[PDB]
Amino acid sequence: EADCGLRPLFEKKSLEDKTERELLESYI
Amino acid sequence: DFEEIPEEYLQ
Amino acid sequence: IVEGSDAEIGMSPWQVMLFRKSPQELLCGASLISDRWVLTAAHCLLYPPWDKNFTENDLLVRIGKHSRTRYERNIEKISMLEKIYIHPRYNWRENLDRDIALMKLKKPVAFSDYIHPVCLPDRETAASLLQAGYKGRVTGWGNLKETGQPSVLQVVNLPIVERPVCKDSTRIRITDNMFCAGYKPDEGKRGDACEGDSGGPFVMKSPFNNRWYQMGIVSWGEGCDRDGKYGFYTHVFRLKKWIQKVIDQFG
Ligand SMILES: C[n+]1ccc(Cl)c(CNC(=O)[C@@H]2CCCN2C(=O)[C@H](N)Cc2ccccc2)c1
Ligand SMILES: *[C@@H]1O[C@H](CO)[C@@H](O)[C@H](O)[C@H]1NC(C)=O
Ligand code: NA
Numbered sequence: 509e510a511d512c513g514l515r516p517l518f519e520k521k522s523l524e525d526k527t528e529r530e531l532l533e534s535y536i
Numbered sequence: 537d538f539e540e541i542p543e544e545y546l547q
Numbered sequence: 548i549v550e551g552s553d554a555e556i557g558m559s560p561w562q563v564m565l566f567r568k569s570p571q572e573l574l575c576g577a578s579l580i581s582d583r584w585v586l587t588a589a590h591c592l593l594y595p596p597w598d599k600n601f602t603e604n605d606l607l608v609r610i611g612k613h614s615r616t617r618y619e620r621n622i623e624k625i626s627m628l629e630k631i632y633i634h635p636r637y638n639w640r641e642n643l644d645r646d647i648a649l650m651k652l653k654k655p656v657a658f659s660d661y662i663h664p665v666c667l668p669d670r671e672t673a674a675s676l677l678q679a680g681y682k683g684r685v686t687g688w689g690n691l692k693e694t695g696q697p698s699v700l701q702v703v704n705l706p707i708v709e710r711p712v713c714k715d716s717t718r719i720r721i722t723d724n725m726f727c728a729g730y731k732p733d734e735g736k737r738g739d740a741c742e743g744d745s746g747g748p749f750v751m752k753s754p755f756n757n758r759w760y761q762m763g764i765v766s767w768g769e770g771c772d773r774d775g776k777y778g779f780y781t782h783v784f785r786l787k788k789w790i791q792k793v794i795d796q797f798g
């Protein structure tokens with residue numbers, strides 16, 4: 509879908525989950 | 537250990 | 548999942564539970580990739596050494612779940628299978644090479660706050676993200692330790708490991724269709740998939756477009772969360788040509 513991978517309760521509302529920042533910080 | 541699911545899905 | 552934590556509600560809306568009809572039992576994890584297609588590990592469906600060979604009528608998929616055992620009325624959707632497709636070169640005899648399978652649902656599932664598909668990687672996203680040290684996320688309702696079961700969906704973030712380290716950790720022959728992830732003994736933190744997590748997704752959030760991509764499928768491991776061992780994952784992008792072929796032909 510064109511909408512794949514965007515979570516209704518997170519990305520779609522611009523809310524971050526409790527640990528996604530750990531992933532981002534690893535992408536150096 | 538699992539809660540029984542509605543019988544509709546087992547048909 | 549060993550040494551993980553409870554998922555947040557709607558944190559992994561592509562998570563699928565493969566469920567045995569009789570007896571009623573969790574079989575495996577899986578993932579939702581469109582309204583009618585679910586991705587899992589081949590060994591969840593076919594593994595002759597253990598007399599495992601499930602047919603479509605043996606199974607259900609349960610989508611939108613959080614609780615492992617509860618029937619989540621008004622939240623989860625339970626779907627029947629139209630057809631199973633296992634990779635034609637899946638190597639169950641030796642090392643689980645090409646451990647991948649697709650399941651087509653009888654009817655499309657409706658998306659909701661709790662039910663939503665994950666993206667599959669293009670070549671560029673795979674090249675950018677599948678690097679040693681980069682972390683992905685694994686989710687499942689499998690065992691909490693090697694030797695019990697969680698009340699709700701578990702999550703753990705794990706770093707991808709360099710290929711030479713993966714190979715040196717095991718006597719099993721590793722192929723280009725696999726990658727491994729997990730912390731090294733000296734890294735302090737830990738975590739791993741375990742029995743019951745098979746077939747679930749290893750996902751990464753692209754920093755380029757802020758979308759979640761499924762880079763791996765939980766495939767195999769020797770024990771769970773042992774020092775000096777790593778979890779092995781099917782390399783989804785390496786097998787994307789087969790995936791697209793199946794969906795194009797039978798979609
Ligand atoms: C203990 N354990 C740890 C991690 C995982 Cl993902 C799993 C789930 N996979 C499995 O149980 C798979 C299925 C077949 C044998 N599996 C294993 O993980 C075997 N323990 C190792 C093995 C790999 C390849 C070929 C033969 C044997 C289990
Ligand atoms: C598994 O089950 C199918 C259906 O009965 C059968 O045709 C097949 O030979 C079995 N073994 C496989 C696919 O390795
Ligand atoms: Na080795």
Ligand code: NA
Nearest residue numbers: 772773774776
């Ligand atoms: Na380990």
